[PDB]
A paper describes a structure:
However, the vertebrate-specific [name] complex with [name] (also called [name]), of interest due to its tumor suppressive interaction with TP53, uniquely encompasses both cullin–[name] and [name] domains. However, the vertebrate-specific [name] is unique in encompassing two distinct types of E3 ligase within the same polypeptide. With 2,517 residues, [name] is the largest cullin and [name] protein, and among the dozen largest E3 ligase subunits, and its structural mechanisms have remained elusive. The [name] structure distinctly encompasses both neddylated CRL and [name] E3 functionalities within a single polypeptide, in a giant triangular, hexameric self-assembly.
A subset of roughly 70,000 particles displayed additional density adjacent to the cullin dimerization interface. A 3.6 Å resolution map over this region allowed building and refining atomic models for the two [name]–[name] protomers in a dimeric subcomplex. Although the two [name]–[name] protomers in this refined map, referred to as A and B, superimpose over most of their length, they diverge in arrangement of some CRL ([name] WHB and [name] [name] domains) and all ARIH-[name] elements. However, the remainder of ARIH-[name] domains were visible in protomer B, while only the Ariadne domain—a key regulatory element—was observed in protomer A. The disparate conformations of the two protomers arises from a striking difference in their molecular composition: protomer A is unneddylated; [name]’s K1881 is modified by [name] in protomer B. [name] K1881 corresponds to the WHB domain site that is neddylated in canonical cullins. The neddylated protomer B shows an activated conformation. [name] and its covalently linked [name] WHB domain wedge between [name]’s [name] and [name]’s [name] domain. [name]’s I44 patch binds [name]’s UBA-like (UBAL) domain to mold the [name] domain into the active E3 configuration. First, the neddylated WHB domain is rotated roughly 35° and translated about 10 Å away from the cullin scaffold. The neddylated protomer B showed additional density associated with the RING1 domain that could not be attributed to [name] or [name].
Numbering used by the authors:
A (entry chain B): 1871 to 1902, 1921 to 1952
B (entry chain A): 1367 to 1434, 1465 to 1608, 1611 to 1665, 1691 to 1741, 1743 to 1822, 1830 to 1838, 1842 to 1858, 1863 to 1907, ...
C (entry chain B): 1511 to 1668, 1691 to 1726
D (entry chain A): 2159 to 2162, 2165 to 2217, 2292 to 2321, 2323 to 2353, 2362 to 2388, 2391 to 2400, 2403 to 2426
E (entry chain D): 21 to 35, 40 to 61, 66 to 108
F (entry chain C): 21 to 59, 67 to 106
The structure:
């Protein structure tokens, strides 16, 4: 469930995305779980290759 | 207006009521001294002691409530220090030879600290006063009393740790009490008691480490500051180094096998682990040595030991060509595990020797055992005590050793327990002998003389060979002893510079 | 095997660690879950045995210390969160069955940086904060009694069960709502409830 | 005799530790009449300095260095007072802080005397003594920076502090014995 | 009959914008909201609170505890 | 008979010297020398049967040429 919620959040922001912490805040708000749980889901998704890290701006993350 | 009034009113009053009368007593000191004595039985709500304690509490808190060094806080703190010092001095004189010195000491610390928190509220300066008072009380004591106290502290720590490790069900209570009780012992930091206490801690921790760890580091994490020369941590560092050495030895063996196979092709066993100790930070009595291995050991074990010694020698080679060389003296210490019949037994090295002797024989004479042993027979009897017990399968009857007839499947851990040593005019004789040797050595050199460290080297060598060409006279000297004796001689004007 | 082959060098140990990590990642979610649960159970069972048992214990305990360095490869991976969740659930019962011994603090001083949110350290610190609160409650009682004595002294001038309390933060302990007391007077004796 | 005072008498049986008065906590040499204890400089050298006159408690630079050392000692005393005047801290932090204060005070005192000193090679001793004392000073300062009580409750680096204190103690013993 | 010699009881202390500067949790930083032209990203910490990097930078430069739970603040570096 | 399953032997290692303190640097000889101590530190001895740090005596010989204990010439007695 966290994975699909995060996928929807990343898709909504498009080519702008967000800094990871802002995205955690968005998902936690949409929940109504721990920040670490969301970060774990994020890492698993990144390993799956659905999302990538913006090389130019490592702070923000970019879906692909 | 406040500051003016309060200063002028209270500060003379405290400066006058905290001054020690010629007898050695002040007023607030007397009140606070009465506080604890009445608090002994000041728990019943309907009793005069309750009102008395409440009144003293209110007085003290009103007096101290102004602080945010200070003008009046100094005097009240010193009064608390004096009270605590007198209390601890009295108690210490009372029961310094009891078999329960250390729990009572810790309980007294707890009572004094709780009383201070009740009388003045939570403040750090009063805690500092309490620590200083305990230290001062400890200091003003004769030497033998201090030595006994240090021995008792070390024995207590060792007993608690050993009980926690062996005792299963109440061991948790012992360990919790130990962690609670460690705090008073930290008072010894910054005294000569630290020096005399490190010694006995060394002696007991050696046996604990050999017989059985991981709790020792935990204890050292909070009692660390107390030890001046830091030898206890050095022991654990030594254990780690020994493990690294074993790994290196394995790699060396593999390399040698590879070289042998290259040269050739160019055309059910006991598990032995070896532990190496440094002499800087490990107490080993030279009576515990093993001199002739083949005389008291089987052949395979001797082969393994010999090959390890060869590895050590060959590893001591590189810039180290210039400098002294290292060796290996084997000791009777250590532990061993045997599997006899159904049961599994744990013994020490000497006990392993005694037991393996029975492999092809049904009886041995104690006289023959001690004759072949070349060890002090008191050690033999000490190691034989647990063997001749009920669990031990051996009995010595007038005596000759014989087997215990069978009578299940449980490990039997039989090892001698630690034999605590008690402090009972040797120092005078030792000083005299060292001095006489010194004066002879310095009389031998005329006006040519010697350097201070040269004289040190000569006296140290003489004592290493020993003034004995005897046993009544002859311990190992240190440079501190040489410097002390030469200080006495200089004071006698016998040496000039 | 690595040390025998390539000698002791730095980068090969890091290679070994990264290999183990990558292998744990190439797994299914159910299996990651089961593995994490097995790790938590292993720690709990070793500590239980060592504290309870005697010499077999002290034997098992040095082994326990050896085996931790493999476990610690988990840090920084995804599996950390599930491992920590499982660890909390046994550390709870262990702390309520026995006070916070040396063992729990030592294991944590080894493997602490693995736990992402640092929940176990917070449980341990909670026990200590509670002892401090006990001290303060004692003092507060004394102050109340002093006020009573003073008021009565101005008007005039005009064999028990020991009990200790423990407070736990719900941000760190897994206390199920099934485990509660609702009408405390009804289900408990009188003096206790007082 | 004890000079501060108090009427207790002091005797030294061996140079294992080094002694102050058990009651008041003061040290003086038995050789010459001078209240303080002068480790590096002989009684004659101290007598020449005091007869010629110097700071108390090239030649200009000496005085400057001695004032700097005594000022640092004052700083250590001020730190001890400030920590002692807080309204109970964890035990290990408190005991280490008291020990560090005592060590820094004694080390700065003996280092000031070693500056006052002038085939002698005590220069390396005074040099590494300065190095170690300055390192421990910097560590304490780093652990000093808003609310003191919270800072002490926070604190590890404590191990480094213990190491430095042991170093200072060993070197002080070395200077005392060698002198 | 039975008698109690000791006992231990248990209880819980049952009781969200950027509390330190009180602006809305997802909104901008008031310190820089006075100086219009909004650069503070949110910061997370192990103690599971979310605050503004500006707020926290200043506050920490002053004091070295978490202003909300009395623990040494630790900048969360997991998942990063 | 009686069968062994594991043994742990214990040994010490022995010098041939009784110095226990380096004179040049006044630190305990088995510990590291002063310079190494501030920030592979071996002991060496001479035919004069005086032992010192390798680094201590190296610096002293960069300074002088007489052994600091016996007013004699130095020999890096090898093995
Ligand atoms: Zn005095
Ligand atoms: Zn003098
Ligand atoms: Zn904010
Ligand atoms: Zn902002
Ligand atoms: Zn927080
Ligand atoms: Zn040296
Ligand atoms: Zn060196
Ligand atoms: Zn020589």
């Amino acid at each position: 469930l966290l994975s699909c919620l995060l996928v929807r959040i990343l898709k909504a922001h498009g080519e702008k995305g967000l800094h990871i912490d802002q995205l955690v805040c968005l998902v936690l708000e949409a929940w109504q779980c721990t920040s670490t749980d969301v970060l774990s889901c994020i890492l698993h998704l990144l390993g799956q290759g659905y999302v990538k890290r913006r090389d130019d701006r490592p702070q923000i993350l970019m879906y692909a | 207006l406040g500051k003016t009034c309060w200063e002028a009113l209270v500060s003379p009053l405290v400066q006058n009521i905290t001054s020690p009368d010629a007898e050695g007593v002040s007023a607030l000191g007397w009140l606070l001294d009465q506080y604890l004595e009445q608090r002994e039985t000041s728990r019943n709500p309907l009793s005069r002691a309750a009102s008395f304690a409440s009144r003293v509490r209110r007085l003290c808190h009103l007096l101290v409530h102004v602080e945010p060094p200070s003008s009046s806080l100094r005097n009240i703190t010193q009064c608390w220090l004096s009270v605590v010092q007198e209390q601890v001095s009295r108690f210490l004189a009372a029961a310094w030879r009891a078999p329960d010195f250390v729990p009572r000491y810790c309980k007294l610390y707890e009572h004094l600290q709780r009383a201070g928190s009740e009388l003045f509220g939570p403040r750090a300066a009063f805690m500092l006063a309490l620590r200083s008072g305990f230290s001062g009380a400890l200091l003003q004591q004769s030497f033998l009393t201090a030595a006994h106290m240090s021995e008792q502290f070390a024995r207590y720590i060792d007993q608690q740790i050993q009980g926690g490790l062996i005792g299963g069900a109440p061991g948790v209570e012992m360990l919790g009490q130990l962690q609670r009780h460690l705090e008073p012992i930290m008072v010894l930091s910054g005294l000569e008691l630290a020096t005399t206490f490190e010694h006995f801690y060394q002696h007991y921790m050696a046996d604990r480490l050999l017989s059985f760890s991981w709790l020792e580091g935990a204890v050292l994490e909070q009692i660390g500051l107390c030890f001046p020369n830091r030898l206890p941590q050095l022991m654990l560092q030594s254990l780690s180094t020994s493990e690294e050495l074993q790994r290196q030895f394995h790699l060396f063996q593999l390399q040698r096998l590879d070289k042998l196979f290259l040269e050739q092709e160019d055309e059910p066993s006991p598990a032995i682990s070896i532990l190496v100790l440094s002499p800087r930070c490990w107490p080993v009595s030279p009576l515990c040595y093993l001199y002739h291995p083949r005389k008291c050991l089987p052949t395979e074990f001797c082969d393994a030991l010999d090959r390890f010694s060869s590895f050590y020698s060959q590893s001591q080679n590189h810039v180290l060509d210039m400098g002294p060389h290292r060796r290996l003296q084997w000791t009777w210490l250590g532990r061993a595990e045997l599997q006899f019949g159904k049961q599994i037994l744990h013994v020490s090295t000497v006990q392993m020797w005694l037991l393996l002797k029975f492999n092809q024989t049904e009886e041995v004479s104690v006289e023959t055992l001690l004759k072949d042993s070349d060890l002090s027979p008191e050690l033999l009897l000490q190691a034989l005590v647990p063997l001749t017990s009920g669990n031990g399968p051996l009995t010595l009857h007038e005596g000759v050793l014989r087997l215990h007839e069978p009578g299940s499947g449980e490990a039997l851990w039989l090892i001698p327990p630690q034999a605590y040593l008690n402090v009972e005019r040797t120092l005078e004789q030792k000083r005299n002998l060292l001095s006489c040797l010194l004066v002879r050595i310095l009389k031998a050199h005329g006006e040519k003389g010697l350097h201070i460290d040269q004289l040190v080297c000569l006296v140290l060598e003489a004592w290493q060979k020993g003034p004995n060409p005897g046993h009544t006279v002859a311990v190992a000297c240190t440079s501190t002893d040489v410097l002390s004796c030469i200080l006495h001689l200089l004071g006698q004007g016998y040496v000039k510079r | 095997a690595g040390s025998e082959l390539f000698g002791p060098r730095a980068a090969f140990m890091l290679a070994l660690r990264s290999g183990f990590s990558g292998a744990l990642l190439q797994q299914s979610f159910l299996t990651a879950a089961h593995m994490s649960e097995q790790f938590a159970r292993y720690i709990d069972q070793q500590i239980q045995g060592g504290l309870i048992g005697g010499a077999p214990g002290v034997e098992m305990l040095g082994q326990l210390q050896r085996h931790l360095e493999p476990i610690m490869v988990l840090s920084g991976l995804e599996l950390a969160t599930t491992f920590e969740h499982f660890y909390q659930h046994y550390m709870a019962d262990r702390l309520l069955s026995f006070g916070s011994s040396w063992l729990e603090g030592a294991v944590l001083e080894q493997i602490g940086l693995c736990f992402p949110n640092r929940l176990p350290q917070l449980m341990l610190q909670s026990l200590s904060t509670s002892e401090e609160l006990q001290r303060q409650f004692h003092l507060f009682q004394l102050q109340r009694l002093d006020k009573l004595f003073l008021e009565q002294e101005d008007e005039e001038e005009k064999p028990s069960p020991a009990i200790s309390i423990l407070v736990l933060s719900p941000r760190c302990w897994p206390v199920s709502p099934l485990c509660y007391l609702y009408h405390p007077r009804k289900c408990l004796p009188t003096e206790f409830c007082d | 005799w004890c000079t501060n005072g108090c009427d207790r008498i002091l005797c030294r049986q061996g140079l294992g530790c080094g002694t102050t008065c058990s009651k008041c906590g003061w040290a003086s040499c038995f050789n010459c009449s001078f209240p303080e204890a002068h480790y590096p400089a002989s009684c004659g050298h101290m007598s020449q300095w005091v007869d010629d006159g110097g700071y108390y408690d090239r030649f200009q630079d000496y005085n400057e260095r001695c004032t700097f050392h005594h000022q640092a000692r004052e700083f250590a005393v001020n730190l001890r007072n400030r920590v002692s005047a807080i309204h109970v801290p964890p035990p290990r932090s408190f005991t280490f802080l008291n020990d560090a204060c005592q060590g820094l005070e004694q080390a700065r005192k003996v280092l000031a005397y070693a500056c006052v000193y002038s085939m002698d090679v005590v220069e390396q001793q005074t040099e590494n003594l300065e190095l170690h004392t300055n390192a421990l000073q910097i560590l304490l300062e780093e652990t000093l920076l808003r609310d003191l009580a919270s800072s002490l409750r926070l604190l590890d680096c404590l191990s480094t502090g213990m190491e430095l204190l042991r170093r200072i103690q060993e070197r002080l013993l070395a200077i005392l014995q060698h002198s | 009959r039975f008698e109690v010699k000791k006992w231990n009881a248990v209880a819980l202390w049952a009781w969200d914008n950027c509390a330190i500067c009180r602006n809305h949790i997802m909104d901008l930083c008031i310190e820089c909201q006075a100086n219009q032209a909004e650069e503070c990203t949110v910061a997370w910490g192990v103690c599971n609170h979310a605050f503004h990097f500006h707020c926290i930078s200043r506050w920490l430069k002053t004091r070295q505890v978490c202003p909300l739970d009395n623990r040494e603040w630790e900048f969360q570096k997991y998942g990063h």
